[PDB]
Design a protein around this ligand. Structure first.
Ligand SMILES: *OP(=O)(O)OP(=O)(O)OC[C@H]1O[C@@H](N2CN(C)c3c2[nH]c(N(C)C)nc3=O)[C@H](O)[C@@H]1O
Lengths: 109, 251, 52, 116
RNA sequence: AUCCUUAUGCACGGGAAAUACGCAUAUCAGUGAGGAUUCGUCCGAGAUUGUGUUUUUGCUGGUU
């Protein structure tokens, strides 16, 4: 089965309310862009990862939040939030529903 | 905030506008020796949220500035303090998220008091917000000019427009009113008051109307801004695009 | 082929704010309330009509 | 949600367990983070100094310079400032001063002789 | 005549998802697909196989 072609196709645009909502998954949000800013001539804030490798979180805090080390809630973009696949979504609910039946038995027995 | 960012004000995010241009004011006089004299009067910070049309006015008393020099900077910090007070009075149900300020001079001094609420975000605007002209409102200015203490007074800027109309247009008209009270001031006031049969009640600010009274009034209020801007800057009104006008109206 | 009108956007009191179709959006604020609010009811009136 | 800074367990368990309990009823700083850089801390200091200078009165800006400073650094600095701005009327400054400064009983007593 | 129930069709209004939706001069399939089990029995309709698109389909508007 054959690779399509490497020729480029003119870029098409649309964006409604609906298509913004879907795309929001696939773009680095605001807060996440500020990690790509590295402020020059001074060391990054880094927090070590579970693994212990340090994760630089660049400008994601304001220079007054560094010095007090507050960290910033800022604005949290709900749009990307991870959500279940279709297959997986019922297997949880179905498991849960079946489980409730089980508990009742022990409730009455 | 931009002309392309304007819609994002009206999402379910709870908001505030804070604009300090009217905080410290000066009155020109002429001395008995005899040259120009300068007296300060009450400083009010106008903080309002578009969805519920609510004001919180802190009425800055003249004696607040009595014993201090460099009254330029002091006012900003006072305002910041007031703003910090304002949010801690609101429960986490009612606490905002985006606080917004026109003056860029206010970004730093807020953050110093806003650390305790890391959720809250602060923006500056490229949109000049005509809440400086809000002291052209009589009822406000009256309460302000008559105020003997630093205080707090709730109001509803939208009267009862909300009962009859969605808050977006309710706020968009409020621009045309205020943008037009920066401009030809009292000569614009007369656009409202042609009918004495149309009464301002004790409650409200803007007088009560029908819908089609506003529909015509808004056209008149719209005209001044187009005439004065062109006239000052020598540009014909007719040339401008739909887009172009909108930017003028916004600032 | 051009037998039929190009469709104009649907607009609502939600979608109202961010439709910058050239028609009096910020300029006439209450004139654009009526158009959308009238517009909404005209669509509904049609639902009622198809029924009766 | 995944930038690594935020998580504190104690908020997390208290926030949750309560939720779980409610459901049942219905049925019925980070140690990772690098310490403040000297340059950035310096920034904070300037701003707080400006605030203090803006009002020589209003000790609200005085205790902040003690308290904000205290969290970031503390020790030599804050304890000297809380003494400096103490210079009579405010009760709040006195209350602040004793708690940070006191450690030792004689000194605590002497501090108390201030407000009194 | 009112009222009520289920199915199907057109439809205003409100949501969720596109790692999802299909297609086949193609294999089987209640004459039992595919699963669960406390081991006594219990649910009962799709599973293979090749393939098309899938950070997007059509359509307008601004600004340069
Ligand atoms: O609505 P309309 O009067 O047009 O009905 P029709 O003229 O088509 O004629 C005869 C049918 O009437 C219905 N009715 C009318 N009434 C008053 C009535 C009927 N049926 C019942 N039952 C059968 C329970 N009870 C009534 O009191 C019937 O469908 C007749 O066929």
């Amino acid at each position: 089965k054959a690779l399509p072609i490497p020729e480029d196709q003119p870029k098409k645009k649309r964006a409604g309310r609906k298509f913004r909502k879907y795309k929001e998954k696939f773009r680095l949000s605001h807060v996440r862009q500020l990690q790509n800013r590295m402020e020059f001539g001074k060391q990054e804030q880094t927090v070590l990862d579970s693994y212990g490798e340090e994760v630089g979180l660049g400008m994601s805090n304001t220079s007054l939040q560094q010095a007090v080390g507050a960290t910033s809630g800022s604005r949290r973009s709900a749009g990307n939030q991870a959500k279940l696949t279709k297959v997986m979504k019922h297997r949880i609910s179905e498991a849960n529903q079946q489980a409730d039946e089980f508990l009742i038995s022990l409730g009455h027995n | 905030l931009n002309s392309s960012n304007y819609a994002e004000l009206f999402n379910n995010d709870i908001k505030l506008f804070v604009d300090d241009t009217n905080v410290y004011r000066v009155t020109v006089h002429k001395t008995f020796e005899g040259n120009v004299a300068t007296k300060a009067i009450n400083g009010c910070i106008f903080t309002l949220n578009p969805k519920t049309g609510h004001l919180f006015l802190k009425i800055i008393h003249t004696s607040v500035w009595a014993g201090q020099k460099r009254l330029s900077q002091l006012a900003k910090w006072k305002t910041a303090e007031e703003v910090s007070a304002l949010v801690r009075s609101l429960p986490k149900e009612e606490q905002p998220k985006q606080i917004i300020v026109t003056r860029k001079a206010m970004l730093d001094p807020l953050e110093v008091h806003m650390l305790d609420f890391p959720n809250i975000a602060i923006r500056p605007t490229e949109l000049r917000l005509p809440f400086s002209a809000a002291m052209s409102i009589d009822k406000l200015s009256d309460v302000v000019m008559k105020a003997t203490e630093p205080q707090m007074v709730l109001f509803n800027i939208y009267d009862d427009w909300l009962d009859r109309i969605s808050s977006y247009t309710a706020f968009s008209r409020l621009t045309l009113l205020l943008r037009a009270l920066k401009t030809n001031e009292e000569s614009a006031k007369m656009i409202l008051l042609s009918d004495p049969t149309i009464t301002i009640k004790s409650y409200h600010l803007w007088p009560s109307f029908t819908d089609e009274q506003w529909i015509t009034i808004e056209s008149q209020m719209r005209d001044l801004i187009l005439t004065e801007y062109g006239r000052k800057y020598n540009v014909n009104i007719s040339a401008l695009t739909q887009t172009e006008i909108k930017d003028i109206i916004l600032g | 082929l051009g037998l039929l009108p190009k469709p104009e956007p649907k607009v609502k009191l939600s979608n109202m704010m961010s439709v910058f179709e050239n028609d009096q959006n910020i300029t006439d604020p209450t004139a654009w309330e009526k158009v959308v609010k009238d517009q909404v009811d005209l669509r509904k009136r049609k639902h009622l009509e198809e029924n009766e | 949600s995944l930038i690594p800074g935020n998580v504190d367990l104690n908020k997390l368990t208290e926030e949750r367990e309560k939720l779980l309990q409610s459901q049942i009823d219905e049925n019925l700083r980070v140690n990772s983070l690098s310490d403040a850089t000297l340059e950035d801390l310096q920034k904070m200091r300037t701003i707080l100094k400006s605030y203090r200078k803006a009002d020589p009165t209003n000790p609200q800006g005085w205790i902040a310079s003690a308290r904000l400073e205290e969290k970031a650094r503390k020790f030599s600095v804050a304890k000297k400032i809380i003494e400096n701005g103490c210079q009579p009327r405010s009760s709040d400054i006195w209350l602040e001063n004793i708690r940070l400064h006191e450690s030792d009983v004689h000194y605590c007593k002497t501090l108390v002789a201030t407000a009194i």
